[PDB]
Symmetry: D2
Subunit: 256 residues, 4 copies
């Protein structure tokens, strides 16, 4: 099977609905070994719990608050020490202050802006810099992004700008790391019911809109994202780097 005997770091499991958890399962289903990380103590339990559901042999679960330089750096030392070699990292982390995800992007504070950039965009680069030390056989680094990073999506505001910065980081990191045998890609996922969609929008109204209008006439699932993540980490995706695959039932192609 595609990922037999390879080991991957998964970052961003918060709960059962986490896109990261879809990715975890698809990779596990494809025969991967998994390392999870989680942000801060309010979660160790929900991630270990999930990790444990997976058939057989304990997955490492590590703390990694990506705003913290030394725990990020320690996280990957542990990985260097526990396992030696990984074959990729799935970066599934985003955060902005909730107040910034409503009315007028022009009103966002510089602290708001830089917090979003720091956690939603710069973290990929920080992670990629540690990941590099421990991917001596090469492989793929993946991030998740969203269409609001390319075109304007109401209320996505500062996150849109931080997705744009994320997608551009993908390209430049692809240009740095290719020579070291490492391919960097994104998945642009369609809107999905997650911890991170608990907010506003009348989210239901937007899913309904995807259902009526997306080419595939349905909304996307965390398993659809995770199967495209299996492709990207697999050998099938060798010649693919610097790319953004939309797993969104085709919505991204529409105009009016």
């Amino acid at each position: 099977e595609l990922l037999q005997g390879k080991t991957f770091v998964v970052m961003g499991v918060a709960n059962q609905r986490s896109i990261a958890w879809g990715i975890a399962r698809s990779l596990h289903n494809a025969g991967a070994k998994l390392i999870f990380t989680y942000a801060g103590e309010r979660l160790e339990r929900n991630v270990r719990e999930l990790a444990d559901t997976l058939e057989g042999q304990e997955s490492l679960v590590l703390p990694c608050d990506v705003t913290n330089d030394e725990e990020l750096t320690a996280c990957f030392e542990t990985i260097k020490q526990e396992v030696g070699t990984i074959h990729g990292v799935a970066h599934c982390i985003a955060f902005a202050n909730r107040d910034d995800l409503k009315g007028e992007f022009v009103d966002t504070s510089r602290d708001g802006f830089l917090l979003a950039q720091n956690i939603s965009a710069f973290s990929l680069t920080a992670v990629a810099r540690e990941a590099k030390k421990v991917m001596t056989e090469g492989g793929n680094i993946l991030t998740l992004t969203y269409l609001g990073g390319e075109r304007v999506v109401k209320n996505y505001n500062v996150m849109g700008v931080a997705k744009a910065s994320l997608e551009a980081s993908v390209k430049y990191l692809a240009n740095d790391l290719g020579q070291h045998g490492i391919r960097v890609n994104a998945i642009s996922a369609g809107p999905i019911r997650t911890l991170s969609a608990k907010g506003v929008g009348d989210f239901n109204s937007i899913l309904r809109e995807i259902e009526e209008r997306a080419p595939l006439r349905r909304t996307t699932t965390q398993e659809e994202v995770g199967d495209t993540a299996v492709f990207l980490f697999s050998d099938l995706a060798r010649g693919v780097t610097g790319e953004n695959i939309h797993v969104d039932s085709g919505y991204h192609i529409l105009g009016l």
Copy 2:
């Protein structure tokens, strides 16, 4: 194994270097059965011998000149008669008059322009129209495009405009066919030495630019395109339609 139980139509094999022969090989390795179509009688011997290098039952090998509506139609009629159900088509077809592939694009004759449009872009639509009839369980339709459709490539000229037309075509067809359970996607391959590289303005130099400047520091293989085609035909890609995956060693990201 991944495409177990499924049959695909591969159009465009002309010899062992054809990117279509790369896709055929990857699809067979992933358990598919194949039907091959070829441009005209002069190619029949090559295609029958390639097909027969693969283990398993024989493989239909049918003439299909995409310029000839009766031939196109009888071809897929024959396919419905003998197999009943397909799961996908790989369209790997292009042509323009070779004198239009030098000098200035502005000097392209009307006949020249419409011939390139006819064979290089409209054929995807005619193919799709007949494939929709035998795609009884849905599936994927793939074509092959090139960066000249997006950005100016010297001498690519009228093929450049026909690729843009092809890629717009993928969008519109994905929008049509989603609701019939059918996805439509393109692979944008980097340059590869094939028959359609014959006569190009120092292809060797082009190959060197890629090798030294592409994020991955190597040229694209027919096998790399074929493994991405596997993904796109597989159920891994069920959320992915109207997409153009660049398999070009990340070359497409580069500015200057």
Copy 3:
């Protein structure tokens, strides 16, 4: 009137006073340009001839130019050459597809329908640039008009959408060819506007309605807004701009959902 003072432009595709080409003709004229008009058919000849006539100064040459017809293309620019010697640019505002293709599924478009739309709506830019090349002696700009449907899927635009992708790639390749001859080539991507080429589209009114309420500028596009950006592209101000597609659509093109 100054800014295009002392320059002459060919405007192709005026069919009545709502034509985008006529918004363009007025702006060019108000910027001091002299104008040559083309038409294709027998009768909307006057229509064009009568619109021309309203323009204040010297009378305008008005010439038949069916872009489907090589001889007529050659004769028209030939006649421009004999009559005025030098022109400074061309506005190409011309599209056609069979009406039955602009509904239903794109996958049912016939071969003839496809090639017809490419011929008139995409190739014709190139045929016109080739003729214009020989009369654009001091350089200048070639324009064309496109639509968002050439970049992303717009319901029912179908075959014209593909023909606009085709048009847009032609702008780039022609820009690459002609720059060394002092000629720039650019597109304006206009918002939906009420013209003859909008007659027969499902729900044109509700299209304009959701432009008004959702586009950043909260209003639909006008012919005059298109013509004023045309003035820029034909003027010296734009001398560093080529192979560009400028969206004059109240900002609509930036929106997802």
Copy 4:
């Protein structure tokens, strides 16, 4: 004539070769009155001297270090009281630590990253929310971008990611401010020999490349940018917002 009786804030003049100085000339030749900002004494005289060369008479030259919220606010507060109404702002500001404009982008420091983001991207939004306060007749906000925010440019690294973020901000800002009669647009300029090109590796080779491969066969001047800027601030451009106009001799259209 074209900008008769309008006033514009021009930000970023550093010396006579500044793009922002090219824009002030064009705006002035089109009838505008101008207000200038600068950060820090290192160049107060330069901007004063330059502003004084101008043949109308007599421009406010105010301090505005976009890093400083109290100073930004004050600068636009001073403008509120002293001029009244403004019709536009040209934001020609960028900065990143020069140690980050070489080597691999992946080795970029946290605060290197957020510094570039803060000066080169966020400042637009900060400037735009002031300005909003003073553009009571509406008008245009312009920023300068570079192709490296769309595609990978060697060494541009953290600035390319910053420009991507800048360009996304343009889109979101335009969605915010359009309802207030305010347009927001970028100009993507070709390489120009300014202070911000000092130290770029092989800059003369970049220029020679542009001259020989760019469609217009020449390199890009400050006057070309200033004249496109005149268009964007004028009534001619009233239907244009959220646009990025490439003023780069057509270079942006080239593939390989």
